[PDB]
Design a protein around this motif. Structure first.
Motif, PDB file in Angstrom:
ATOM      1  N   UNK A 104       0.821  -1.205   0.000  1.00  0.00           N
ATOM      2  CA  UNK A 104       0.000   0.000   0.000  1.00  0.00           C
ATOM      3  C   UNK A 104       0.858   1.259   0.000  1.00  0.00           C
ATOM      4  N   UNK A 105       1.961   1.248   0.751  1.00  0.00           N
ATOM      5  CA  UNK A 105       2.874   2.384   0.735  1.00  0.00           C
ATOM      6  C   UNK A 105       3.590   2.506  -0.602  1.00  0.00           C
ATOM      7  N   UNK A 106       3.838   1.381  -1.278  1.00  0.00           N
ATOM      8  CA  UNK A 106       4.458   1.445  -2.598  1.00  0.00           C
ATOM      9  C   UNK A 106       3.506   2.034  -3.634  1.00  0.00           C
ATOM     10  N   UNK A 107       2.241   1.623  -3.616  1.00  0.00           N
ATOM     11  CA  UNK A 107       1.287   2.073  -4.620  1.00  0.00           C
ATOM     12  C   UNK A 107       0.468   3.279  -4.179  1.00  0.00           C
ATOM     13  N   UNK A 112      -6.468  -1.269  -3.358  1.00  0.00           N
ATOM     14  CA  UNK A 112      -7.783  -1.641  -2.849  1.00  0.00           C
ATOM     15  C   UNK A 112      -7.669  -3.034  -2.247  1.00  0.00           C
ATOM     16  N   UNK A 113      -8.130  -3.192  -1.012  1.00  0.00           N
ATOM     17  CA  UNK A 113      -8.032  -4.461  -0.302  1.00  0.00           C
ATOM     18  C   UNK A 113      -9.378  -5.171  -0.356  1.00  0.00           C
ATOM     19  N   UNK A 114      -9.378  -6.407  -0.841  1.00  0.00           N
ATOM     20  CA  UNK A 114     -10.574  -7.238  -0.889  1.00  0.00           C
ATOM     21  C   UNK A 114     -10.355  -8.479  -0.027  1.00  0.00           C
ATOM     22  N   UNK A 115     -11.303  -9.409  -0.102  1.00  0.00           N
ATOM     23  CA  UNK A 115     -11.192 -10.676   0.603  1.00  0.00           C
ATOM     24  C   UNK A 115     -12.003 -11.722  -0.141  1.00  0.00           C
ATOM     25  N   UNK A 116     -11.668 -12.985   0.101  1.00  0.00           N
ATOM     26  CA  UNK A 116     -12.386 -14.094  -0.508  1.00  0.00           C
ATOM     27  C   UNK A 116     -13.605 -14.520   0.297  1.00  0.00           C
ATOM     28  N   UNK A 117     -13.876 -13.867   1.426  1.00  0.00           N
ATOM     29  CA  UNK A 117     -15.034 -14.177   2.256  1.00  0.00           C
ATOM     30  C   UNK A 117     -15.986 -12.988   2.353  1.00  0.00           C
ATOM     31  N   UNK A 123     -18.239  -7.745  -7.599  1.00  0.00           N
ATOM     32  CA  UNK A 123     -18.640  -6.513  -8.274  1.00  0.00           C
ATOM     33  C   UNK A 123     -17.587  -5.424  -8.116  1.00  0.00           C
ATOM     34  N   UNK A 124     -17.045  -5.267  -6.909  1.00  0.00           N
ATOM     35  CA  UNK A 124     -16.008  -4.264  -6.721  1.00  0.00           C
ATOM     36  C   UNK A 124     -14.692  -4.702  -7.348  1.00  0.00           C
ATOM     37  N   UNK A 125     -14.463  -6.011  -7.493  1.00  0.00           N
ATOM     38  CA  UNK A 125     -13.304  -6.456  -8.263  1.00  0.00           C
ATOM     39  C   UNK A 125     -13.450  -6.095  -9.738  1.00  0.00           C
ATOM     40  N   UNK A 126     -14.656  -6.257 -10.299  1.00  0.00           N
ATOM     41  CA  UNK A 126     -14.874  -5.841 -11.684  1.00  0.00           C
ATOM     42  C   UNK A 126     -14.724  -4.332 -11.840  1.00  0.00           C
ATOM     43  N   UNK A 133      -7.172  -0.149 -10.696  1.00  0.00           N
ATOM     44  CA  UNK A 133      -6.545  -0.023  -9.391  1.00  0.00           C
ATOM     45  C   UNK A 133      -5.858  -1.320  -8.986  1.00  0.00           C
ATOM     46  N   UNK A 134      -4.776  -1.185  -8.220  1.00  0.00           N
ATOM     47  CA  UNK A 134      -4.064  -2.350  -7.707  1.00  0.00           C
ATOM     48  C   UNK A 134      -4.918  -3.028  -6.645  1.00  0.00           C
ATOM     49  N   UNK A 135      -5.100  -4.338  -6.780  1.00  0.00           N
ATOM     50  CA  UNK A 135      -6.004  -5.105  -5.934  1.00  0.00           C
ATOM     51  C   UNK A 135      -5.191  -6.093  -5.114  1.00  0.00           C
ATOM     52  N   UNK A 136      -5.411  -6.093  -3.803  1.00  0.00           N
ATOM     53  CA  UNK A 136      -4.838  -7.083  -2.898  1.00  0.00           C
ATOM     54  C   UNK A 136      -5.989  -7.886  -2.315  1.00  0.00           C
ATOM     55  N   UNK A 137      -5.972  -9.194  -2.539  1.00  0.00           N
ATOM     56  CA  UNK A 137      -7.024 -10.085  -2.069  1.00  0.00           C
ATOM     57  C   UNK A 137      -6.473 -10.893  -0.906  1.00  0.00           C
ATOM     58  N   UNK A 138      -7.104 -10.760   0.255  1.00  0.00           N
ATOM     59  CA  UNK A 138      -6.667 -11.461   1.449  1.00  0.00           C
ATOM     60  C   UNK A 138      -7.375 -12.810   1.551  1.00  0.00           C
ATOM     61  N   UNK A 139      -6.975 -13.596   2.553  1.00  0.00           N
ATOM     62  CA  UNK A 139      -7.470 -14.953   2.792  1.00  0.00           C
ATOM     63  C   UNK A 139      -7.295 -15.830   1.551  1.00  0.00           C
ATOM     64  N   UNK A 140      -6.038 -15.959   1.126  1.00  0.00           N
ATOM     65  CA  UNK A 140      -5.715 -16.715  -0.071  1.00  0.00           C
ATOM     66  C   UNK A 140      -5.920 -18.209   0.048  1.00  0.00           C
TER      67      UNK A 140
END
Ligand SMILES: Nc1ncnc2c1ncn2[C@@H]1O[C@H](COP(=O)(O)OP(=O)(O)O)[C@@H](O)[C@H]1O
Ligand SMILES: Nc1ncnc2c1ncn2[C@@H]1O[C@H](COP(=O)(O)OP(=O)(O)O)[C@@H](O)[C@H]1O
Ligand SMILES: [Mg+2]
Lengths: 302, 347, 646
Positions: A104-107, A112-117, A123-126, A133-140
């Motif tokens: 997040x500090x780099x970009x 934008x932080x998302x999650x798989x749960x 919809x917000x990923x689309x 925007x750069x997307x980080x998806x947690x709970x891999x």
């Protein structure tokens, strides 16, 4: 320098691809067996090769360290692998869940932080991939196969635009869109479909990393003077190399279209480079002597 | 005079830097116009084919089609319409004195690549047709340069069209042929019978006088008044079929008579047939089996086969126009292959 | 007549079994047939009941989820209530054939409703009706069953309280003489198409029987769990030989021997997992052809030297390697233009896999089950092959927030598009699309039979039958009875539906149950791609690094062992680079203790792409620096020459 480009490129590409998910001892063993394989098949590599020195510059290292990355060389190599994986989507495995802050500090604010749960995740990923925007998806560990055409990059080129199929509709992409996947549980079941198609890296802390961190800490507090002297010489050498390049460009501009002052400045700079290299040549083996001195502490600690 | 048959060997060979996609013939002078896969349009002389007369690059992507026309105003010149995958349609003009291409205008409006273009003149008015991957067939005007009408006849993208007066047929990728009346904009009938996407569809044109023709003769005064009897299609199922065009209520489509029916099916191609062209009573076609076949309209059987005509695929074929008395049917046929060979057959 | 599954060659074992089966029915006794999976219980069973003037057929197949409601509904279409239960016929008795009675599973209390229901109607001669408390006396309705032995997993051991009332018959495998006679008859029927080779029917059958015996003896179950052989392999060999002969050109002796060898390769040795096992099979084919068909002018019988394909022509003939590779390259370029685009590399193994997938997808009811490492080109290869044949590709979008309703809706849409629209469908099923056991049960129902009966019920069943009747009347076929509509519908589904199974980790228990399932194993065609061998790795690497400038410096050719270089012998730096990359991939996979797991070559392809990009960038930077220093040195030399001149 030119006769040892193919071997260094082979080593760096293998280091980028294979060595994402290995600890330091296995990384060293695989690197020495790769050097043995290069020496067997008569391909010349750099005898003093270092991955961080060869691939990334000091500016990227300073940017990563300012953003929040740890000072460990293993973490520096992992971050360099992550930022140089332009094709395969990087997969970060953080027990501490810390690298979200670094990315997040780099970009900046583009992350934008998302999650798989979640429920509005798709919809917000689309929306994010449409905007770029750069997307980080947690709970891999709970990867959802809706983004199977983003992981495998199965795009179709709709003429002057690029499109990906997510769900039951076609959504556009952007040239600056970058996907990151984050994980927190090292024991989680990563699906083979994702695991074979991501740049999986390990930001973990192992017992070999305990040995390296013990050496790093005893070097930082036991004799800080050697560490700051080495850092000062490295920074001074990089700045002097940049200054010599600038003076060379100025001399080329002068020769193409005064000249004595530029020649004197270039000669003084070259003598300064020679003196700095001669001073730094007799200082590096003292660090190896200290490494040989601080091995019992690492063995006792592990 | 229409019974000309090319010999078993090419008269001359043409070297191109890349794959040939479309070839057309100048209807007044012995000059060929050979497209490329790099967007370049060429022009070779049939007596001096060592060097091109011109070489213009006006398309970023590969050229998909080409169709030439000699203008008839009640000054006369040549209009060359080239279409390409770079989302643009370009309309050229052949300068006969200087041997140079001078672009008149460029036609835009399609959301994807384009497949085929046709140009025709009804009465002192030149119109240019086009079909694209956006499932819409839109035609333009040569003088105004603006679109006139568009329509989406198919669920997926169309691949080839042809024009005569105010009727446009369009083969497509959903293996269904459709004939649409352009001023009405409604499809008269739908086709079914090919198992693979269609490649080239063109109208079958009648002839003035002949001893006997079974495929270009109107069997009744109703067919004579309508001006269309039959049409021919080629598709990726290695087949060439002749379709009878059902006549609707008279234009409003007929629910009971709005379906194409196949009449005569020609088989024998070892791979996909790419382009077809009818000349006299012969249905020349080229396929992907490195061969060019010379079908016959009357007996329905092949008369001459040119095996191994190219190293790779045989992309495009073109002969001279015979149905119009304005354009003479000269005895030259040029084929275009994937192996950079534009073989020309003369005498 | 070799595609009809009810065609039975009457041998002495079949006649003996039919006689004792008739004697056991006539004694008013149940029959349980237990034996190996290819012994022929169902075939002898249906042949014995089909030509019977005293017994009818109630064909039902048991599953894991089976209740007594299915059995009662299957009785209600052949029995009438008069209390006494009587069959609709007045003379012919009724026989219930219950295939795979071991498949019903015990509850949490170790019992199953279905087997107890069969025991109740088989000992007490009747059953108690549920909704009005009536006893239904049965006086002439018989009952039989078939099952695999309960030793293999998936077959629940069954209680002796039920099996004590039924006589058990063990159907063993036919002997060598019986198989030789049966497939002599089969090859005579096949070679009736080729009248000039009528004298070769016996040696071909003897060669095929010896091949099956040797393949069963060598590749036992102890090596791999899916190494199960049966006479069904020989029947599939005969059917493949017929399918190739029927649409092929005029065949000589060498062409026929090579065609039989190709079919044996694609049937017996599709599932072999080791290079040494494939070499053993190649030697076995050499020995079999030498012993039984002593003919000269025979080439290599390797997998890559036998390339039969009907894509390049109008007939199923042996195509050249170079022409086929060029055609596949051009077709794949067109496919990437018209469909999804991936940068694939055309090697010999990919061409062979395209050929066998195309061979399997052209068969009626031709399903596939692909096993191999990840990123070996299975899904995209199946998509390309289905694009060649015109099959519409349907891929289920199954995610973790899904249940049986979404999968059932997807399958319903696929079935409706297959029948009501007459569009050929290539349903690609991945192992990640199956989460619970119920998905596997649905797939087993779809594969074993030609329809899932539990999908349609009630109003959905009524509207589906109305649409089916409308479709039948649309094509002008006079069908009115429900049985004619139903079996025409399942015939259409079995004709125009192809299911391709993609399995990436066969070591996993879910994929182990996927492979070991009897409906999938006995119907699908296994194709074990496995991991890449070093020849394919060398071909991919040489095709991937030849587009970048790499020969700029002098390279001294060293001396090495013969087996330590997998690429063609080293002459340039590219061969050394390819050999180094292959050697490190092998060493890395060996020292990570992966075991006998398949090796995904995704690391190798990613390393090749990264090496190409890095070599491009580094060589561009080095050439820029060389040009800069050369320009500077030339300018300095000109300046010093001007100074020395004046
Ligand atoms: N006596 C025989 N005559 C003809 N074919 C046979 C004979 N015995 C076995 N087969 C072949 O073996 C296969 C057995 O199939 P099947 O009856 O379905 O086995 P199971 O019912 O045990 O699964 C058949 O496909 C058939 O081709
Ligand atoms: N010649 C090749 N053979 C197999 N895979 C290749 C080849 N060239 C590239 N690939 C890689 O294979 C990937 C496609 O694999 P895919 O078929 O989707 O895997 P799976 O077989 O597990 O479905 C592509 O991303 C591509 O990078
Ligand atoms: Mg069985």
């Amino acid at each position: 320098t030119s006769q040892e480009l193919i071997g260094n490129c082979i080593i760096s590409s293998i280091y980028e691809t294979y060595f994402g998910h290995l600890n330091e001892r296995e990384r060293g063993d695989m690197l020495v067996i790769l050097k043995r394989l290069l020496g067997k098949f008569a391909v010349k590599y750099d005898v003093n090769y270092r991955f961080i020195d060869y691939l990334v510059t000091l500016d990227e290292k300073m940017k990563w360290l300012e953003c929040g990355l740890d000072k460990n060389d293993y973490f520096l190599e992992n971050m360099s692998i992550v930022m140089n994986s332009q094709d395969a989507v990087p997969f970060l495995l953080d027990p501490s869940s810390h690298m979200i802050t670094v990315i997040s500090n780099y970009y900046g604010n583009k992350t934008v932080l998302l999650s798989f749960l979640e429920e509005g995740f798709v919809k917000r990923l689309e929306n994010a991939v449409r905007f770029g925007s750069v997307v980080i998806i947690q709970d891999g560990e709970f990867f959802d196969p809706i983004i199977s055409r983003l992981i495998s990059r199965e795009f179709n080129h709709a003429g002057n635009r690029v499109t990906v199929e997510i769900g039951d509709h076609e959504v556009d992409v952007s040239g600056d869109f970058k996907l990151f996947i984050h994980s927190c549980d090292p024991s989680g079941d990563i699906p083979i479909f994702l695991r074979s198609r991501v740049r999986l890296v390990h930001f973990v802390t192992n017992k070999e990393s305990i040995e390296t961190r013990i050496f790093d800490i005893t070097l930082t507090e036991e004799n800080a003077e050697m560490q700051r002297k080495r850092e000062d010489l490295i920074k001074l050498n990089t700045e002097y190399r940049l200054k010599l390049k600038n003076l060379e460009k100025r001399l080329l501009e002068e020769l193409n279209n005064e000249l004595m002052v530029t020649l004197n400045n270039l000669k003084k700079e070259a003598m300064n480079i020679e003196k700095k290299l001669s001073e730094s040549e007799e200082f590096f083996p003292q660090f190896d002597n200290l490494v040989e001195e601080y091995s019992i502490i690492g063995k006792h600690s592990v | 005079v229409l019974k000309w048959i090319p010999r078993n060997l090419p008269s001359c060979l043409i070297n191109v830097e890349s794959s040939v996609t479309s070839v057309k013939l100048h209807p007044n002078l012995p000059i060929v116009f050979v497209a490329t896969d790099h967007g370049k349009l060429y022009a070779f002389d049939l007596f001096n084919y060592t060097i091109p007369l011109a070489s213009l690059q006006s398309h970023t992507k590969a050229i998909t089609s080409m169709d030439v026309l000699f203008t008839n105003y009640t000054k006369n010149y040549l209009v060359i319409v080239t279409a390409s995958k770079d989302l643009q349609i370009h309309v050229f003009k052949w300068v006969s004195e200087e041997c140079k291409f001078q672009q008149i205008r460029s036609l835009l409006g399609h959301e994807h690549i384009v497949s085929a273009v046709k140009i025709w003149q009804k009465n002192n008015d030149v119109h240019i047709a086009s079909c694209s991957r956006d499932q819409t067939v839109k035609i333009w005007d040569f003088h105004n340069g603006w679109s006139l009408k568009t329509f989406q006849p198919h669920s997926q993208w169309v691949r080839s069209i042809d024009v005569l007066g105010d009727y446009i047929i369009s083969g497509s990728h959903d293996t269904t042929l459709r004939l649409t009346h352009w001023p009405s904009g409604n499809g008269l009938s739908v086709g079914t019978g090919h198992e693979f996407p269609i490649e080239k569809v063109k109208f079958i044109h009648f002839i003035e006088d002949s001893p006997e023709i079974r495929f270009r003769t109107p069997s009744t005064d109703r067919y004579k008044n309508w001006g269309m009897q039959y049409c021919v299609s080629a598709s990726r199922d290695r087949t060439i079929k002749i379709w009878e065009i059902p006549l609707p209520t008279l234009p409003i489509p007929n629910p009971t008579d709005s379906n194409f029916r196949c009449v005569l099916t020609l088989k024998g191609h070892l791979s996909w047939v790419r382009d077809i062209s009818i000349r006299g009573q012969y249905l020349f076609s080229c396929a992907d089996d490195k061969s060019v076949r010379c079908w016959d309209l009357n007996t329905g059987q092949c008369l001459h086969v040119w095996e191994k005509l190219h190293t790779g695929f045989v992309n495009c074929l073109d002969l001279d126009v015979d149905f119009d008395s304005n354009v003479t049917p000269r005895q030259m046929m040029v084929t275009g292959g994937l192996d950079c060979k534009s073989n020309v057959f003369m005498r | 007549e070799v595609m009809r599954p009810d065609i039975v060659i009457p041998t002495i074992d079949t006649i003996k079994h039919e006689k004792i089966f008739y004697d056991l029915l006539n004694s008013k006794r149940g029959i349980i047939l237990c034996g190996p999976p290819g012994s022929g219980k169902t075939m002898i069973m249906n042949n014995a009941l089909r030509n019977s003037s005293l017994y009818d057929v109630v064909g039902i197949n048991f599953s894991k989820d089976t209740t007594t409601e299915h059995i009662l509904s299957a009785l209600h279409r052949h029995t009438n209530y008069v209390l006494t239960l009587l069959p609709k016929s007045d003379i012919k008795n009724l026989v219930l054939f219950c295939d795979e009675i071991n498949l019903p599973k015990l509850d949490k209390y170790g019992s199953q409703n279905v087997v107890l229901f069969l025991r109740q109607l088989m000992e007490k001669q009747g059953f108690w009706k549920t909704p009005e408390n009536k006893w239904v006396t049965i006086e002439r309705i018989h009952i039989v069953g078939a099952c695999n032995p309960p030793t293999d997993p998936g077959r629940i051991p069954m209680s002796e309280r039920f099996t004590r009332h039924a006589a058990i018959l063990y159907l063993g495998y036919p002997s060598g003489k019986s198989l030789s006679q049966i497939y002599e008859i089969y090859y005579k029927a096949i070679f009736k198409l080729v009248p000039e080779f009528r004298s070769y029917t016996e040696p071909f059958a003897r060669a095929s029987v010896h091949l099956y015996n040797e393949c069963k003896a060598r590749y036992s179950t102890g090596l791999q769990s899916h190494y199960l052989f049966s006479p069904r392999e020989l029947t599939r060999l005969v059917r493949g030989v017929y399918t190739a002969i029927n649409t092929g050109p005029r065949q000589t002796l060498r062409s026929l021997i090579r065609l039989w060898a190709y079919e044996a390769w694609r049937i017996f040795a599709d599932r072999l997992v080791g290079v040494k096992e494939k070499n053993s099979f190649e030697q076995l084919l050499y020995e079999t052809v030498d012993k039984y068909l002593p003919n000269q002018d025979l080439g290599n019988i390797s997998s890559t030297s036998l390339l039969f394909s009907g894509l390049l022509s109008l007939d199923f003939k042996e195509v050249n390697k170079t022409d086929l590779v060029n055609f596949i390259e051009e077709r794949f370029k067109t496919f990437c233009d018209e469909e999804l685009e991936v940068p694939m590399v055309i090697h010999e193994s990919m061409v062979d896999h395209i050929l066998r997938i195309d061979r399997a997808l052209k068969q009626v009811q031709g399903h596939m089950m692909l096993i191999g490492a990840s990123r070996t080109g299975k899904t995209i290869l199946t998509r390309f092959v289905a694009w060649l044949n015109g099959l519409k590709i349907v891929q289920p979008k199954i995610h973790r927030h899904s249940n049986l309703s979404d999968f059932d809706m997807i399958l319903k849409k696929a079935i409706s598009d297959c029948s009501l629209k007459e569009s050929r469908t290539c349903l690609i099923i991945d192992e990640s699309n199956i989460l619970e056991t119920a998905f596997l049960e649905r797939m087993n129902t779809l594969l074993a039979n030609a329809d899932i009966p539990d999908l349609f019920q009630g109003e959905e069943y009524d509207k589906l039958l109305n649409n089916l009747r409308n479709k039948t009347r649309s094509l002008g076929l006079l069908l009115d009875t429900e049985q004619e509509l139903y079996d025409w519908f399942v015939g259409e589904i079995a004709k125009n539906l192809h299911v391709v199974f993609t399995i990436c980790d066969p070591t996993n228990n879910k994929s182990s149950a996927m492979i070991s399932s009897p409906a999938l194993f006995n119907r699908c065609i296994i194709n074990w791609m496995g991991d890449w061998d070093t020849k394919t790795m060398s071909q991919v690497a040489n095709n991937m690094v030849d587009v970048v400038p790499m020969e700029f410096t002098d390279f001294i050719v060293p001396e090495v062992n013969k087996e330590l270089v997998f690429t063609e012998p080293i002459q340039t730096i590219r061969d050394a680079v390819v050999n180094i990359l292959i050697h490190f991939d092998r060493n890395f996979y060996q020292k990570m203790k992966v075991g006998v797991n398949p090796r995904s070559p995704g690391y190798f392809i990613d390393g090749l792409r990264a090496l190409v990009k890095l070599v491009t960038a580094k060589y561009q930077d080095l050439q820029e620096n060389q040009r800069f220093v050369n320009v500077g040195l030339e300018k300095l030399n000109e300046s010093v020459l001007k100074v020395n001149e004046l």
